[PDB]
Structures are given as structure tokens and as C-alpha cells.
Amino acid sequence: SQAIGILELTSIAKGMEAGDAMLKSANVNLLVSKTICPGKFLLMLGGDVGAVQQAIATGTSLAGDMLVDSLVLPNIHASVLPAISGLNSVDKRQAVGIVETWSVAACICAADRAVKASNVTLVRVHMAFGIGGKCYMVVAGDVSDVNNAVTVASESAGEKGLLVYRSVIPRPHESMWRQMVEG
Amino acid sequence: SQAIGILELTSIAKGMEAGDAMLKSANVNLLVSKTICPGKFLLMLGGDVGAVQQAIATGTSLAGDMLVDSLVLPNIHASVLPAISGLNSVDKRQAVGIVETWSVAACICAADRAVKASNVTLVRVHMAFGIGGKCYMVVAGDVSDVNNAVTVASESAGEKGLLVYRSVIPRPHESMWRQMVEG
Amino acid sequence: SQAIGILELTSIAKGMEAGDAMLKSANVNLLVSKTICPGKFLLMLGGDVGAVQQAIATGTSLAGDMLVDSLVLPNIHASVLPAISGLNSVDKRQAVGIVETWSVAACICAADRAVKASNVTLVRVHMAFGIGGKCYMVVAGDVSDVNNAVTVASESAGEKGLLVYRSVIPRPHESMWRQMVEG
Numbered sequence: 001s002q003a004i005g006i007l008e009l010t011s012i013a014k015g016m017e018a019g020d021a022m023l024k025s026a027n028v029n030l031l032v033s034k035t036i037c038p039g040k041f042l043l044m045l046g047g048d049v050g051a052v053q054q055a056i057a058t059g060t061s062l063a064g065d066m067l068v069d070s071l072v073l074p075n076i077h078a079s080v081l082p083a084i085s086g087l088n089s090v091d092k093r094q095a096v097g098i099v100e101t102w103s104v105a106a107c108i109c110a111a112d113r114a115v116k117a118s119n120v121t122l123v124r125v126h127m128a129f130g131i132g133g134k135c136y137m138v139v140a141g142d143v144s145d146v147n148n149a150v151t152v153a154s155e156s157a158g159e160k161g162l163l164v165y166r167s168v169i170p171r172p173h174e175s176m177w178r179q180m181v182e183g
Numbered sequence: 184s185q186a187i188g189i190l191e192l193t194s195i196a197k198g199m200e201a202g203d204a205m206l207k208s209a210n211v212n213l214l215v216s217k218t219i220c221p222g223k224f225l226l227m228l229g230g231d232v233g234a235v236q237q238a239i240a241t242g243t244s245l246a247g248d249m250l251v252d253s254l255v256l257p258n259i260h261a262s263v264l265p266a267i268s269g270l271n272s273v274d275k276r277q278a279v280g281i282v283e284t285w286s287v288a289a290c291i292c293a294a295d296r297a298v299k300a301s302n303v304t305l306v307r308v309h310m311a312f313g314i315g316g317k318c319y320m321v322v323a324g325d326v327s328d329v330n331n332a333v334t335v336a337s338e339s340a341g342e343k344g345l346l347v348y349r350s351v352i353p354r355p356h357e358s359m360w361r362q363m364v365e366g
Numbered sequence: 367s368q369a370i371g372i373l374e375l376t377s378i379a380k381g382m383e384a385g386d387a388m389l390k391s392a393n394v395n396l397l398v399s400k401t402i403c404p405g406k407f408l409l410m411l412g413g414d415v416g417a418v419q420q421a422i423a424t425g426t427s428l429a430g431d432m433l434v435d436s437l438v439l440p441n442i443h444a445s446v447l448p449a450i451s452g453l454n455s456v457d458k459r460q461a462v463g464i465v466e467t468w469s470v471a472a473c474i475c476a477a478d479r480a481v482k483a484s485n486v487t488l489v490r491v492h493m494a495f496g497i498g499g500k501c502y503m504v505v506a507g508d509v510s511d512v513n514n515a516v517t518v519a520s521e522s523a524g525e526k527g528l529l530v531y532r533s534v535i536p537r538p539h540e541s542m543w544r545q546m547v548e549g
């Protein structure tokens with residue numbers, strides 16, 4: 001349905017150049033474009049799989065030896081893309097689930113699976129660092145639905161030994177709600 | 184008078200879960216709830232000592248092996264708690280004092296002592312990292328009073344070899360004032 | 367024309383004290399005053415070279431063994447100073463150039479040379495870390511002028527093996543423009 005493309009670079013200038021080139025190269029939307037660590041840079045793009053593969057090929061080729069890593073995740077539910085670039089709005093607040101993973105790939109796949117197997121809202125997906133760092137997703141919905149989402153996402157990261165922790169919180173305390181849903 | 188409770192975790196999901204649980208567990212107010220370093224998480228709570236000990240016991244027990252450290256500081260002047268969660272308002276601007284310490288414990292105890300031995304306003308308490316990192320307090324008041332506060336806070340951190348630096352600045356330059364008092 | 371003074375310290379309290387003292391010491395303007403890394407602090411000042419040398423001597427002497435490094439860059443074009451403290455406004459948007467360097471010294475000298483050899487606007491100068499970290503400048507102007515600026519700045523950092531990467535982007539994509547010009 002949509003693809004996600006990721007490109008991580010050692011150079012900020014190279015990253016702006018690559019972001020520019022990738023956007024001109026194909027019909028894709030920028031989801032993420034930011035520096036991280038002591039001078040690294042991360043681009044994430046979405047769009048149809050052909051356009052994303054073409055963007056990330058362009059960018060990988062431009063990156064040369066300043067490339068940390070790049071990846072194309074095909075077949076990602078469309079609702080995941082806005083959870084990566086911002087926050088989705090919460091349509092139902094009974095429970096919150098959070099799944100924390102090693103690597104943004106594990107976290108996107110887990111969220112995709114969560115959204116495909118349940119009816120929760122994927123509220124947001126957050127990366128501590130880069131492609132290889134700690135990442136976590138937050139889901140919101142009725143307690144049964146959140147339980148199911150979290151189970152599937154946990155299983156998904158867990159098969160690969162990349163699950164860090166999972167939690168279902170029915171009725172989140174008012175003092176934690178905003179942080180959970182806005183970051 | 185109030186207690187401060189601190190809980191530091193290796194997991195963001197676990198931290199949200201623990202924050203939620205601690206708040207439901209006892210009558211305490213969240214002062215701090217934030218990620219730090221490459222994917223760590225810090226909770227700080229305040230309230231009556233019984234409620235804080237009960238919150239932090241709950242959270243410590245939930246944390247398991249994802250716990251970095253937890254602590255309860257009893258008997259902390261109430262004015263310290265808002266300096267931890269935000270900024271106290273400045274009632275008098277003649278001088279600013281700053282004491283920088285190793286560890287937020289050394290810094291809270293030093294600030295408490297400062298406030299108990301002088302009449303300064305504790306404007307804010309700031310942590311670079313977590314529980315074990317660099318922290319500093321800023322006080323404001325008449326120059327004599329600030330001198331006394333800074334002396335006591337310095338002595339307090341210094342007894343333990345945790346004083347990093349101390350400074351009294353009568354009449355702070357206009358170009359540094361806001362940074363001193365707002366961070 | 368103007369000088370830039372830089373003072374990097376291991377102590378935040380010492381840094382506030384030194385910033386205060388440097389500003390009282392000479393007719394200089396604070397450009398930068400911020401913490402970085404796990405509890406470091408950076409001051410940058412501008413003004414006439416005499417006043418900047420006097421400020422930084424004062425601050426170096428105050429810093430003692432908490433000094434990481436200090437430097438005075440004489441003869442810097444005035445337009446560089448606002449690019450360090452904020453953003454200069456863009457008067458012409460045909461192309462953007464970006465030069466990324468090792469060390470803020472290499473980056474300021476390169477930008478100065480860029481501005482002295484071309485007619486571009488220096489939009490901003492950015493530091494990832496401190497004095498020794500990754501830094502980059504962004505210039506904007508007609509494509510020929512930007513090509514010339516970037517060439518000169520590249521040569522300048524490159525003579526010393528401190529050039530990381532350089533890029534000219536005629537017609538920057540709308541989705542990258544704001545990040546390029548505002549950071």
C-alpha cells in the first residue's frame with residue numbers, strides 16, 4: 001500500500017543534497033529529515049513502492065561512503081506514514097499500548113503488523129537515535145484491541161530478538177496522557 | 184516537609200508504564216518525566232514522604248532489571264519541587280548564585296540546604312543528563328543572602344567531593360540574565 | 367572588520383560566570399551561549415578586535431583548568447556574526463550552497479572567505495557540537511555566485527584537511543528549502 005524509504009548519512013551537507021535529489025527523483029513525500037548523534041543525518045520518505053525504490057537508489061548512489069544504511073520497507077499501511085512524520089489523532093482513548101524495539105525497521109514492521117491485525121489507532125512512532133537505535137510506537141484504542149495490537153507487534157519484534165519492552169495501559173493517568181500521545 | 188522520588192530506567196516504554204503506575208499508587212505529583220541519553224528515561228515525583236516511598240517502591244518493583252537507580256530524598260523544602268519541574272519566579276534580582284554538582288541527589292540536597300539556611304529564591308534546578316550526571320541550581324536574592332546560600336550548598340556537595348563549581352554574580356549582565364534565570 | 371571570540375568550558379556554572387565577566391569586560395556582543403555534550407558550555411562573542419581579545423583573555427583567565435579551548439578570529443566580515451547568532455535573511459533564492467567542515471574555526475574562516483570572494487548571502491552557520499565538532503554554513507544567491515562561494519570555502523577548509531563535504535543546489539526542492547535556510 002505505501003512504502004517507507006530510509007537513508008542514514010554521516011554528513012549533514014550530503015544529507016541535504018541527497019534529500020533534495022531524492023525528492024526531485026520520484027513522487028515521494030519527505031516524512032523525516034533531521035540530524036542526530038554528533039553530526040549524522042536521517043531521511044525517511046514515503047510513497048508508492050516504485051517511487052520509493054527509485055528515490056532511495058538515487059540517494060544511496062549519491063551518499064557513497066557517507067552512507068550509514070538505507071532500506072525500503074514495502075507494503076506498509078498508509079496510517080503508519082503520518083505516525084512517523086507527526087502524530088495521528090486519537091479517535092479513542094480507553095487504553096494506550098507501547099512497544100519499544102531495537103532499530104526503526106523492527107519498529108515500523110511491528111507497527112504495520114499491529115495496524116493490520118487490530119483496529120487501534122497508531123498514534124506515533126518515535127526514534128531515539130537513527131536506523132539502529134531504540135524506537136517505540138504508541139497505539140490507542142479499546143483495551144481488547146490494544147492488547148491484540150501489542151501482542152502482534154511484540155511477536156513481530158520478538159521473533160528477531162529486537163523487542164525491548166511492551167506495555168498495555170488501560171485508563172492512562174491524566175498526568176501521563178499527553179506525554180504518551182504527543183511525545 | 185516534601186519528599187522527592189527519583190526513578191531512572193533503561194526503557195522508555197517501561198518508564199511510561201512505571202510513571203503511570205506510580206501516579207496511580209499514591210498521592211504524588213509528577214515533577215519530571217523525560218527521556219535522556221541514547222534511550223534512557225527519568226521520573227521524578229514529589230509529595231509527602233509516605234506517598235513518595237510507596238510510589239518509588241511500586242516503580243522500583245515494576246522496573247526490574249531495567250532500573251538504573253531510584254532514591255527517595257526525605258525532608259526537602261517545598262520550594263525545591265517547582266524549581267525541579269519548572270522555574271520559580273524571581274522576587275529579587277540583586278545577585279544570582281549558581282552551584283554545579285555531580286549527581287542530582289547532591290544538587291537537590293545542596294539546594295535544600297541553601298533554601299533552609301538563607302532567604303534566597305531557588306529559581307531552578309537543572310540536570311544535564313540523569314541521576315548521576317552534571318546538575319546545577321540557580322538562586323537569586325540580595326548579594327549577602329546569595330553568598331550565604333552558595334556557601335552552604337557548596338559545603339554540602341563539597342563534603343562528598345561532588346562540588347564542581349560555585350559562583351556568586353552580583354548585578355548579572357543583561358545579556359546573561361535570562362539564560363541564568365530561565366535556562 | 368569584526369572579530370569572533372570563542373571560549374569553551376567544562377563547567378556550566380563557570381561558563382555563566384565567564385560570560386558575565388566577558389560581557390562586562392569589553393564592548394562585545396554575545397553571539398552564542400549554550401551548553402553542549404554531556405555538560406559542556408560554549409560562549410561566542412563578537413565586536414572590534416581589541417575588545418574581543420580583551421574579553422577572551424578575561425574569560426580564559428577565569429576558566430583556568432575548566433577551559434576546553436579559546437580562540438580569537440580577527441577580521442571576519444560583519445555579516446558572519448548574525449549568521450552565527452541566528453539566521454540572516456535571504457535576499458535571493460536561486461541556489462543554496464552548503465559547506466561542512468571539521469571545527470567551527472575552519473567553518474567561520476571558510477564562510478568569511480566565501481562572503482569576501484562572492485556576493486552570496488551567508489544565511490547561517492551551524493555547530494553540531496563545540497569548537498572541535500562538525501559545523502556547516504549555508505549560503506544563498508545566484509547559482510554562479512554560490513558556485514564561487516562554495517569553491518572558495520571548500521578550498522579554505524580543504525587546505526587544512528578539514529573539509530567534510532560541499533554541495534551546490536540550484537533550485538532547492540520546496541520540501542527541503544525551509545530546513546536549508548532555517549535549520
